[PDB]
């Protein structure tokens, strides 16, 4: 089991196409926002407690029931059908605010075409005030109210926050980003025109880039001075920030965003072209390789954060303290800006980031394009053109508030209220349904007869008490402690919390809506109604 060769071969054949923004972009930002080091242990314990069991359960359901992400509940719970609509709303919100990162990255890619790097050019090229280009080439100490050139670039070109005084007053629309998101939507529309991808060819050509570019970025960050301060801060247990800090919510959000469960994507990817093919192992190796890639990304971010903090002679956890999604772009710009072939590496990294984000967002709409096929196979299954275009237009019209000058004022709100309580409560509802409403012993018998090997005893005790209690505790800690958002020199008002709670409620209130709508259809007393509705209908 150690250095036998088969394990390293299986990991080498899996590290190529097992990386998403949930572990290269979402993990470093969350880990650095709540303090590095003090997040790794809660993240990994919450993972090993309630991320692998739910992943395996969703995979087993998708492989056994052979139904979509919504039609699978017809055989599980006729009442718990609104969870499909909740998953659809969550995926719509994601595709609304997740494509803005791709828009920014593609604008960076377009701007990187010039032989001269605009990152190291804040000498009033277009307009930039109060910037310091030379870090150590001038032998001048860092002054008060000084920002990095890459920070000024990200704050004044791709996301013009100076036009909007705050979230209450959003500016106009940026045409340079509107055309970018339009091109991105045109590209994503020409890739889901068929909807079949299980043995494609593009997967290899998009997986061959990370295995090399991540390694070259890692060695570049390793051969960079001052990185010793960042590595020590990344491996700090920091037990003081674990007792009663309530950081487990962000850990669970990162886990459910990087692994896949909670968004209705494992069911779609499991209910096709697979039945009894090496179960109980593929999920584990996928989780392991995802955690490994996440740790590699965190390390390659922190080894550059260490240099950025050493070149300023200030604390590591203070350089980017009021920064949201700006942590990744500024870090990558400052890391690539110190390389011989900086422009080529920059354009290659931006292109691979674009194709990785595209391959990641291909899975978001995949679970919603096939959800209506297994639910309405008589009206939507014959068109295949009047539904994908409709959902693309709806996403374009729903992703316009995140394209204004106050971009980060909306992305930061949807980064902790659209997937924080929503995905968590959806996973909790699904787990408690599969546990109590359907029966643990029944599902155990099904997986035993479809696999030939009953799961371990540790897995049976998980889905009954481990995951539901932990998710309930996380939800209670979130409700009894409203977060405090704070961008660069900005504080969110009191109505922002109400807006976030309303956003995190519309994606969940549909389940009680369907619950109240289901009982008023069938006649009879309440007891007979629940008795006849709990039991699934004939397949």
């Amino acid at each position: 089991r150690e250095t036998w060769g088969k394990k390293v071969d299986f990991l080498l054949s899996v590290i190529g196409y097992a990386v998403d923004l949930g572990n290269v972009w979402r993990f470093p930002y969350i880990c650095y926002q709540n303090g590095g080091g003090a997040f790794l242990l809660p993240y990994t314990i919450m993972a090993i407690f309630g991320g692998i069991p739910l992943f395996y359960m969703e995979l087993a359901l998708g492989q056994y029931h052979r139904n979509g992400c919504i039609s699978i509940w017809r055989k599980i719970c006729p009442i718990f059908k609104g969870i499909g609509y909740a998953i659809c709303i969550i995926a719509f919100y994601i595709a609304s605010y997740y494509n803005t990162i791709m828009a920014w990255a593609l604008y960076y890619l377009i701007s990187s075409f010039t032989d001269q790097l605009p990152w190291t050019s804040c000498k009033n090229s277009w307009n930039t005030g109060n910037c310091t280009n030379y870090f150590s080439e001038d032998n001048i100490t860092w002054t008060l109210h000084s920002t990095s050139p890459a920070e000024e670039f990200y704050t004044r070109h791709v996301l013009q926050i100076h036009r909007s005084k705050g979230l209450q007053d959003l500016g106009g629309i940026s045409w340079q980003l509107a055309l970018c998101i339009m091109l991105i939507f045109t590209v994503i529309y020409f890739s889901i025109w068929k909807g079949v991808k299980t043995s494609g060819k593009v997967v290899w050509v998009t997986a061959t880039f990370p295995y090399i570019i991540l390694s070259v970025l890692l060695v570049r960050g390793a051969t960079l001075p001052g990185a010793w301060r960042g590595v020590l801060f990344y491996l700090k247990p920091n037990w003081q920030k674990l007792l009663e800090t309530g950081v487990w919510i962000d850990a669970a959000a990162q886990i459910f965003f990087s692994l896949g469960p909670g968004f209705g994507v494992l069911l779609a990817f499991a209910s096709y072209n697979k039945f009894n093919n090496n179960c109980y192992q593929d999920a584990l190796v996928t989780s392991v390789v995802n955690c490994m890639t996440s740790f590699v990304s965190g390390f390659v971010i922190f080894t550059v954060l260490g240099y950025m903090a050493e070149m300023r002679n200030e604390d590591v956890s203070e350089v980017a303290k009021d920064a949201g999604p700006s942590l990744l772009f500024i870090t990558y710009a400052e890391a690539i800006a110190n390389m011989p072939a900086s422009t080529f590496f920059a354009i290659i990294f931006f292109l691979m980031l674009i194709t990785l984000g595209l391959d990641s967002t291909f899975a978001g709409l995949e679970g919603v394009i096939t959800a209506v096929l297994d639910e309405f196979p008589h009206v939507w299954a014959k068109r295949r053109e009047r539904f994908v275009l409709a959902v693309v237009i709806t996403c374009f019209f729903g992703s316009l508030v995140t394209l204004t000058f106050g971009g980060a004022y909306v992305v930061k709100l949807l980064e902790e209220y659209a997937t924080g309580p929503a995905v968590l409560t959806v996973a909790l509802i699904e787990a408690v349904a599969v546990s109590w409403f359907y029966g643990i012993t029944q599902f155990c018998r099904d997986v035993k007869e479809m696999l030939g090997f009953s799961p371990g005893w540790f897995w049976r005790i998980c889905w009954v008490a481990i995951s539901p209690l932990f998710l309930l505790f996380i939800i209670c800690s979130f409700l009894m402690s409203p977060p405090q958002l704070r961008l660069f020199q900005y504080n969110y008002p009191y109505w922002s919390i109400i807006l976030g709670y309303c956003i995190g409620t519309s994606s969940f209130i549909c389940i009680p809506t369907y619950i109240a709508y289901r009982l008023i259809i069938t006649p009879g007393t309440f007891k007979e109604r629940i008795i006849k509705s709990i039991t699934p209908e004939t397949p």
Partner: antibody
Amino acid sequence: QVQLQQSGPELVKLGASVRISCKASGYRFSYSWMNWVKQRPGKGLEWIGRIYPGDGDTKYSGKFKGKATLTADKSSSTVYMQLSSLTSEDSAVYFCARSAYGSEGFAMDYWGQGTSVT
Amino acid sequence: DIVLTQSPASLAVSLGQRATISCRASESVDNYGISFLNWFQQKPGQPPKLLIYAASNQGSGVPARFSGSGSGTYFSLNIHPMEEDDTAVYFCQQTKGVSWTFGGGTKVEI
């Protein structure tokens, strides 16, 4: 206060070359632009080019792309402009318009006395 | 090379009167909300000093007698409390991209 001095009067020589010294003091030298405008006697004004101290960028208008060069020097905090092929109508004065610190984009009054050539 | 020429050519000096100067920038549009335009003042035998920058703010060491407004293409200048001591020539400069070029200029004389 930011001091700014220039060279003295010179003579126009056909086909020869001249150098105009312009040293800044009392401000961040290699952090802002350094324009070079031309003021004909009695006539209007015109732009020649700009250079950032530090060999970063070197732009021009289009009518003096080859007849006027720009050279920076971060050591002595001076900026030179070596002319070439002086003509009869080029007899005018030149200033050192220090550009603003970015977003504003103006000249913060630091205009030299001007070097006249005849 | 975005050319920019002023429409007026010469005005008259009068105590307490309105006089505006316009700048033709039809082939120009605001870039990042800040009007990349400047206003200078050149007296006979004196280097031009800053008068008004960004067409909205007041220059360094300039009295409140001068004030400018406008956005986009047309820009004006309010010099209502004008006296004999302001008998200089004013220009117009735009700073959008690499197109820095001055204007024709306007003089005042009674």
